[PDB]
């Protein structure tokens, strides 16, 4: 409801964006290993 709120929501979104990228990368390593 304000510039500050939008910027705080953006911060939250970009932290989530990071977490998904990291987890995706970790899942990809686990998935390749699951091919023995």
């Amino acid at each position: 409801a304000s510039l500050d709120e939008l910027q705080a929501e953006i911060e939250q979104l970009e932290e989530r964006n990071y977490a998904l990228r990291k987890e995706i990368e970790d899942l990809q390593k686990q998935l390749e290993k699951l091919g023995a």
């Binding site: 953006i10 979104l13 964006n17 998904l20 899942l27």
Partner: protein
């Protein structure tokens, strides 16, 4: 114009987070199932 720029950034991040979470969830299902066969 700043407000409009931030609102568009919110929308863009949500859309991209939606794509990422969908990918993460696909991989979680594959990993979870392959790992517990």
């Amino acid at each position: 114009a700043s407000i409009a720029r931030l609102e568009e950034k919110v929308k863009t991040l949500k859309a991209q987070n939606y794509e990422l979470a969908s990918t993460a969830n696909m991989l979680r299902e594959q990993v979870a199932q392959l790992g517990a066969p």
